[PDB]
């Protein structure tokens, strides 16, 4: 992360699709380098639904400029999350902040 920043890094990282943003709040039922399974909260759960969200991170995929696209999980097992919270940092991203 940049030691001296402007505070716009979080907005750029969140708005861009490189990072993984939780759709609904809940707890991290299962965390892994490849996939993340999060159990949504009771209130946010739709009727007649299992109640889990699966995010499949893209690992070591080529870009248009022959670079590497890597997503690393940023949450631990059992850590509660809310809507709009970053789950996995994308390329050049540190804890939801742009890291060029």
């Amino acid at each position: 992360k940049p030691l001296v920043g402007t505070g716009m890094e979080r907005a750029v990282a969140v708005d861009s699709g490189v990072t993984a943003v939780a759709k609904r709040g809940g707890v991290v039922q299962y965390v892994d380098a490849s996939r993340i399974v999060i159990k949504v909260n009771e209130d946010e759960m739709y009727p007649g639904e299992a109640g889990i969200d699966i995010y499949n991170l893209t690992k070591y995929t080529r870009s248009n400029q022959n670079t590497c696209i890597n997503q690393m999980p940023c949450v631990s097992l059992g850590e509660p999350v809310e809507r709009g919270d970053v789950l996995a940092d994308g390329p050049s991203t540190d804890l939801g902040e742009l890291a060029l």
Binding site: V31, D32, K59, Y60
Partner: protein, 233 residues
């Protein structure tokens, strides 16, 4: 008479602030001898100190280090990077194979490495990886050697006489065991010369080398190098 002769410097005491930080005190010294000897020792210690480092890593379930394993929170590349910073002390040989076996939820650290008689772990609780799946078993084979300086992968892969089987990941070796050296020359009160000086060297290392042994090795290396100038054809 007195001007022709020189006083003999000597190590007076060794201070061990922590397992890594240490202080070495040398006295007595002349006016300008300290600023020369301490600088030479600092330059020698930063580059020419032998130490042990990890070279090759073998994982049963991993073909190439650019992939991922089920049950581990970090990538194989992250695991290799963590293993690069591992500090071990090996005596009697320069080639040791260690086996790590772990299973169950929780962090996997250097304490899980099987303990042998020769190789010892300076930092037992050095975090290596994390297992986030109950039914996840991780087995690793770690190859450690002894050397000097920093040897990148590009120079080491030059020796391709024997083909490396797929799954033997190569990591950069940082054999240097000394991270920070800071010398300071101040006044010393011995007898009533009122002109002697003493040198204090603060050493910040990985804990795999004795500061006295490091100082002795550096002095021996400098003496061996200066033998050529002493001879002078």
């Amino acid at each position: 008479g007195s001007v022709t002769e020189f006083l003999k410097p000597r190590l007076v005491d060794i201070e061990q602030v922590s397992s890594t930080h240490a202080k070495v005190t040398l006295e007595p010294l002349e006016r300008g001898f300290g600023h020369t000897l301490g600088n030479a020792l600092r330059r020698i210690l930063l580059s020419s100190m032998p130490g042990c480092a990890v070279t090759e890593v073998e994982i049963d379930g991993v073909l190439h280090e650019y992939s991922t394993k089920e049950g581990v929170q970090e990538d194989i590349l992250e695991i290799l990077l963590n293993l690069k910073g591992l500090a071990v002390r090996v005596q009697g040989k320069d080639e040791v194979i260690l086996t790590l076996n772990k299973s169950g939820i929780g962090p996997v650290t250097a304490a899980d490495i099987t303990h042998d008689g020769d190789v010892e772990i300076v930092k037992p609780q050095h975090v290596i990886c994390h297992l986030t799946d109950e039914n996840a078993s991780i087995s690793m084979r770690i190859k450690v050697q002894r050397g000097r300086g920093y040897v990148p992968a590009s120079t080491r892969i030059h020796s391709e006489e024997d083909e490396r089987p797929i799954g033997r990941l190569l990591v950069d070796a940082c054999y240097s065991p000394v991270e920070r050296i800071a010398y300071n020359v101040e006044a010393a009160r011995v007898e009533q010369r009122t002109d002697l000086d003493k040198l204090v060297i603060e050493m910040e290392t990985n804990g795999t080398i004795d500061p006295e042994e490091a100082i002795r090795r550096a002095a021996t290396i400098l003496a061996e190098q200066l033998e050529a100038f002493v001879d002078l054809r």
